């Protein structure tokens, strides 16, 4: 799967999230500019940008779920898109596992073991932007007729 | 990861779910008896039983989300348990992908592409049973103090 990673957080554990994600995907853009990640994605017809926002590292150091956003670019509602959705979701689960050793430090951090991330999802369908919705949600709406 | 699969549904797509799961785990018991899967799990100190209940195949043929249950056996609230949780979750995502071709048949089935499964989770913590809760939920409760 082709993914852009946009890392806005300069902290070590953020860097580590980026690294973990990037070993599991086909990096199409890796950096701090969301406009440019959007451009690599539209060019590449890649399905998602994963954003590691500013505050990610600090949350985790505070014993707070870190925010991770996925912007999805759906250009169709078929098999390939379903495969990307499921595959990238699977990759986010795996990232949680690849963060765990870093959460062993404080007691503050111990919840985070099982549930370290707060995943926010946005969906482009045919160039319509549905903020704060996952593709499942968007698809369940439309197909609920 | 060590998992028991308990398949109560005799349909083809159920069989296929079992097969997909089983190629990705270390089968500890595979069959239709939940008491016996519970016994292989407690013996093996495995973390989960995945149940494919009766009605799974029919749901999917009807264009309805199929029910999949996970019973988790937590004997601790640490790294290993967090790794199982995240890993098995990742495996459930992957199963969704491995079902997809079978959902290409009807228009009834087209939603299911993105969201084919209704995942019900139960958690044993130290021999206390918390029906209808995931380990994340149980852990977020206790650590919310
Ligand atoms: Ca650095
Ligand atoms: Ca998902
Ligand atoms: Ca058969
Ligand atoms: Ca989970």
From TrEMBL, chains A, B:
List of residues binding Ca(2+) 2: 89, 136
Family listed: Belongs to the ABC-2 integral membrane protein family.
Binding locations of Ca(2+) 1: 15
Source species taxonomy: Bacteria, Thermotogati, Thermotogota, Thermotogae, Thermotogales
Subcellular locations according to the entry: Cell membrane
Protein name per the record: ABC transmembrane type-2 domain-containing protein
Domain of life, per lineage: Bacteria
Organism listed in the record: Thermotoga maritima (strain ATCC 43589 / DSM 3109 / JCM 10099 / NBRC 100826 / MSB8)
